[PDB]
Amino acid sequence: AAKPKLYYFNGRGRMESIRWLLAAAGVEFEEEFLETREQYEKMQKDGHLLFGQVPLVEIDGMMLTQTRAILSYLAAKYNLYGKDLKERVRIDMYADGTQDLMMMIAVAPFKTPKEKEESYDLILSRAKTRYFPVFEKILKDHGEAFLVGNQLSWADIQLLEAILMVEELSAPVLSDFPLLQAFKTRISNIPTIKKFLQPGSQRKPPPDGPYVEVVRIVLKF
Amino acid sequence: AAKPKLYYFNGRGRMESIRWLLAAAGVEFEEEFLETREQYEKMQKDGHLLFGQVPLVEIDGMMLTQTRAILSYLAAKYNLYGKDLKERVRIDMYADGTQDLMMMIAVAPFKTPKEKEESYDLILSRAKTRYFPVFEKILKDHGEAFLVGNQLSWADIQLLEAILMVEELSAPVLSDFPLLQAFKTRISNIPTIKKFLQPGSQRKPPPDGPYVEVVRIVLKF
Ligand SMILES: CCCCC[C@H]1O[C@@H](O)C[C@@H]1SC[C@H](NC(=O)CC[C@H](N)C(=O)O)C(=O)NCC(=O)O
Ligand SMILES: N[C@@H](CCC(=O)N[C@@H](CS)C(=O)NCC(=O)O)C(=O)O
């Protein structure tokens, strides 16, 4: 058997969504870490990071190096990638949207004070007036627990995380999205999802000052 | 019948990779263009666009809207995604770097002449060391026709488009790379590819003056 080890910084980043999916997959995973600019260089020159970039996930003997390349491998392996091509596309179409949303968030910290300020306000508007109303309707129109084949999917997860991450900025955000709140609590109380959500987990906190710089040092921003 | 009427701009942009995919596949297609913002608004008003963002590509009675997804769907349909999920992912990683490379290029015209030089130099220096040496090494190792396990795959098509995408800046670049020049030829020599590379094909021209100014209008950038 394999013991899923994942290298990346100590924070959200492109490794977060990977953690979630694994947790929900009901899988225990250990993990290394990245702190020094030289640490990068070692494993770099070690010959692992195909295009010389992380995240990286030692699993099945393979060394995955590209984000979405990784997620897709995972989700499919652990049957959360729909069944037929018709549905798998709905997942992806969804995942790309949330991803875009979460992405705007993970990046704003590096921006200048005026920059990150203006981008945050915007994140709310793009979530409230573009990404949330759409998901609310998907739920209302088909009235169901899940999002696609009436079964747990990586789109379900991806959405939850996205909702959580958005409330961390504005808590009363879901104020106008009923079907979602239900979705949130419904999914939150899922066994594997709850465990990962309890104070004891591998889950990481939001982007903090110390983390920003510890990043700009390992990669030389 | 099969009428992939994919809506987008008169330029390369995000669709360009999609076009290449349909091309090699051996699938003809139409493509209504994006001229006035009144189109964008009125179309987005009909709920053709999920999160309100093109590429838009109606196919199989459906109406897809998220790039990475669209490629993933097509590639899978037209049997160009490995033999199992391991090949699928391997391909996915490759397709990611190529898409990364093609991305700073595709956005370049938007910046400013000053940035352009640096960025373009960066692209070259990145492509020459970052990606090409990697691909070359691979082709040598498993020494065979295609990058994957002997069969046209999304990767190959992604690489070729990438190669030529850069040669339109540094014609002599592929010189230091033997296996890449060889791969380049045989792949251009694909029946369906050669026909897509013909002077009469739907293949779009690299970005330009009016193309850089249209988006800033239609999409009010
Ligand atoms: C001109 C083409 C390539 C470079 C610039 C474009 O690429 C995008 O990164 C930004 C721009 S314009 C194209 C832009 N697409 C996106 O921003 C979403 C990308 C997503 N992967 C998708 O499948 O649609 C748009 O459709 N409108 C933006 C807006 O209001 O949401
Ligand atoms: N988008 C690529 C990674 C791109 C990227 O910015 N990754 C950063 C983490 S923020 C990295 O790995 N460092 C850049 C480097 O290799 O110097 C992927 O999906 O694997």
UniProtKB/Swiss-Prot annotation, chains A, B:
Domain GST C-terminal: 84-207
A biological process from GO: response to caloric restriction
Outcome of swapping residue 114 to P: Requires 2 nucleotide substitutions
UniProt keyword annotation of Ligase present: no
Primary residence: cytoplasm
Cited Pfam families: GST_C, GST_N
Reactions catalysed, as given in the entry: RX + glutathione = an S-substituted glutathione + a halide anion + H(+)
UniProt EC number: 2.5.1.18
Signal sequence, start to end: none
One function term, GO molecular function aspect: glutathione transferase activity
Alphabetical list of PROSITE patterns matching this protein: GST_CTER, GST_NTER
Chain residues that bind glutathione: 8, 52-54, 65-67
InterPro entries registered for this protein in UniProt: Glutathione-S-Trfase_C-like, Glutathione-S-Trfase_C_sf, Glutathione_S-Trfase, Glutathione_S-Trfase_N, GST_alpha, GST_C, GST_superfamily, Thioredoxin-like_sf
Modification note: The N-terminus is blocked.
Record keywords, A-Z: Acetylation, Cytoplasm, Transferase
Assembly and interaction partners: Homodimer.
Protein name from the UniProt record: Glutathione S-transferase A4
